[PDB]
Amino acid sequence: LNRAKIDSTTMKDPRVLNNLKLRELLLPKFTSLWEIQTEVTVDNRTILLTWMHLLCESFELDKSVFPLSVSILDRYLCKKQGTKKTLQKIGAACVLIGSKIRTVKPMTVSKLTYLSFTNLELINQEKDILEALKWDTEAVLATDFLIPLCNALKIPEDLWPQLYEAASTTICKALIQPNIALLSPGLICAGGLLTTIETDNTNCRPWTCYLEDLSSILNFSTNTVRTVKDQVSEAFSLYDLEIL
Amino acid sequence: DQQYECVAEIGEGAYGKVFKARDLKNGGRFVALKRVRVQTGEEGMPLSTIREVAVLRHLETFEHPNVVRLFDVCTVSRTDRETKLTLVFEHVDQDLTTYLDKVPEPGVPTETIKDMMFQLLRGLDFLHSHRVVHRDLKPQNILVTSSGQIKLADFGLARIYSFQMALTSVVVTLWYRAPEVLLQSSYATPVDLWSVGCIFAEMFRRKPLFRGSSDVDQLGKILDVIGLPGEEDWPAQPIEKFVTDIDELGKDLLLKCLTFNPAKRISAYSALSHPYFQDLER
Numbered sequence: 215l216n217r218a219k220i221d222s223t224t225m226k227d228p229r230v231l232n233n234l235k236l237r238e239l240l241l242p243k244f245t246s247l248w249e250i251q252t253e254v255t256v257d258n259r260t261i262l263l264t265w266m267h268l269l270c271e272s273f274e275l276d277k278s279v280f281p282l283s284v285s286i287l288d289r290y291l292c293k294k295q296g297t298k299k300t301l302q303k304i305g306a307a308c309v310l311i312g313s314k315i316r317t318v319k320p321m322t323v324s325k326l327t328y329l330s331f332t333n334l335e336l337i338n339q340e341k342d343i344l345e346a347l348k349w350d351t352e353a354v355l356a357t358d359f360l361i362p363l364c365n366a367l368k369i370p371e372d373l374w375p376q377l378y379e380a381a382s383t384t385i386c387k388a389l390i391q392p393n394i395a396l397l398s399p400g401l402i403c404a405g406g407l408l409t410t411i412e413t414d415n416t417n418c419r420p421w422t423c424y425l426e427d428l429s430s431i432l433n434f435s436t437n438t439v440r441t442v443k444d445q446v447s448e449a450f451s452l453y454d455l456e457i458l
Numbered sequence: 459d460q461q462y463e464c465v466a467e468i469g470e471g472a473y474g475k476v477f478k479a480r481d482l483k484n485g486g487r488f489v490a491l492k493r494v495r496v497q498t499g500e501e502g503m504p505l506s507t508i509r510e511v512a513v514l515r516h517l518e519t520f521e522h523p524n525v526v527r528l529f530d531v532c533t534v535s536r537t538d539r540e541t542k543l544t545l546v547f548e549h550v551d552q553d554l555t556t557y558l559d560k561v562p563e564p565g566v567p568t569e570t571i572k573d574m575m576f577q578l579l580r581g582l583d584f585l586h587s588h589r590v591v592h593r594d595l596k597p598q599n600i601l602v603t604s605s606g607q608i609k610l611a612d613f614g615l616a617r618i619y620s621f622q623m624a625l626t627s628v629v630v631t632l633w634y635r636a637p638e639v640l641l642q643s644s645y646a647t648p649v650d651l652w653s654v655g656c657i658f659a660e661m662f663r664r665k666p667l668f669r670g671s672s673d674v675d676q677l678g679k680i681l682d683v684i685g686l687p688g689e690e691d692w693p694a695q696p697i698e699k700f701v702t703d704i705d706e707l708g709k710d711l712l713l714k715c716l717t718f719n720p721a722k723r724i725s726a727y728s729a730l731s732h733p734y735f736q737d738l739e740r
């Protein structure tokens with residue numbers, strides 16, 4: 215019931231931003247998403263990712279659960295081979311694992327199975343992800359960068375709550391899409407922010423004005439930044455529950 | 459599964475118990491074994507355990523000197539029974555508790571006091587700068603190696619903090635809880651420093667400072683010492699009484715961690731730089 219309020223230590227310390235970027239360099243580069251796969255396509259992924267998204271959204275889980283569900287799922291689908299009649303399970307086990315870490319009230323098995331395989335059969339599909347990833351579960355989420363970026367960009371604090379709520383919502387959806395899976399979490403975030411800023415100016419400066427800065431903050435070129443915005447702004451638009 | 463043999467039980471941790479044991483395939487040296495009996499109810503691996511490993515794994519490529527190390531997770535699934543877990547860490551000789559209990563008179567040397575404090579804050583700094591709050595900081599969780607080095611242990615209540623995230627109103631053990639938690643308020647990192655305030659003191663006076671029994675009493679106990687603050691700070695008695703044998707700069711630091719308002723309470727980073735510490739590693 216209580217929520218995490220602003221904490222200068224965790225939010226305004228420049229070296230926090232500094233370490234996100236660093237720990238971003240830990241999970242290495244998917245040269246191509248789901249290459250190891252010899253059955254399920256990326257199309258299957260978009261579908262399972264919107265089911266997993268809907269799950270998180272409708273049960274109102276903390277915003278950082280889904281991105282991490284995605285990250286687990288992906289990491290996991292190199293280490294092992296997935297199937298079509300089995301993805302539902304796997305994705306279900308990612309949300310279940312993600313919820314266990316990043317949210318106080320985690321998605322229960324009975325909640326997850328009943329909606330969707332036996333609950334025994336799901337417990338294994340957890341075990342099997344855990345040991346496959348060798349319990350190294352956590353990850354830098356595109357989410358994690360939101361406030362550290364608002365702070366770095368000198369955005370007034372009273373805007374943080376809305377800005378947070380709004381751009382986390384758009385990042386989360388964007389993540390559903392194939393091509394977004396390849397971008398660095400810092401960038402996905404910078405994109406999320408700018409798109410959001412664009413639609414209802416929120417009484418900041420306008421989108422334009424933050425492009426050169428995020429390029430300085432993150433240490434990419436401006437073109438890269440301008441691109442990732444369009445890219446994430448796209449990913450958002452392509453959300454569609456009918457595909458289910 | 460069969461690389462070990464348990465000796466003494468060095469304490470009942472997060473879910474069950476933690477044993478002292480030796481590794482065989484290695485140099486023959488010591489390993490810390492956490493036994494986790496997963497209830498064949500229906501929730502999968504315990505929340506607390508999954509989280510705690512994930513955080514420790516996540517930071518391990520930093521190899522921070524003031525944090526415990528995890529080597530392995532056994533897992534052996536049983537079709538004849540429930541699962542059981544072997545969680546395997548570096549062994550450390552004793553905790554702060556036993557050490558405070560064993561130390562010759564007249565207690566721990568002030569220069570050790572300063573150093574343990576230092577290391578402790580240092581490990582904390584680290585943890586916070588990676589957005590981890592170790593919200594279960596107590597003498598039993600603080601580990602002292604043979605060379606007298608500090609390791610933060612039991613990460614089963616630690617979690618990565620993000621704005622607007624949901625919180626359990628129920629964190630830290632009674633004695634070392636902060637007013638914000640007691641008041642059922644929202645909380646974060648300053649929580650760890652409150653604990654370090656309490657611990658700092660427990661070092662000089664080899665006895666816990668705030669020994670409550672209810673939350674309400676636990677709060678009064680605190681307020682009996684630190685004093686009632688203003689309307690501003692709500693969302694005495696001179697300390698030296700409760701903490702004799704403390705230096706003037708040790709005091710200022712100690713108050714700075716034991717600030718009622720959290721947003722006023724000092725941070726590890728600024729605490730690491732407080733004038734109490736100049737004398738140390740230099």
Ligand SMILES: CC(=O)c1c(C)c2cnc(Nc3ccc(N4CCNCC4)cn3)nc2n(C2CCCC2)c1=O
Nearest residue numbers: 468469471476490526547549550551552553598611612
């Ligand atoms: C899983 C952990 O993080 C962990 C580890 C790695 C650790 C290692 N060495 C310890 N070494 C110890 C710990 C305690 C003692 N004393 C033994 C005699 N009685 C009091 C404690 C001696 N050696 N203790 C450890 N703990 C204890 C903290 C609470 C319960 C376990 C831990 O959680």
Ligand SMILES: [Ca+2]
Nearest residue numbers: 317318319624
């Ligand atoms: Ca929740």
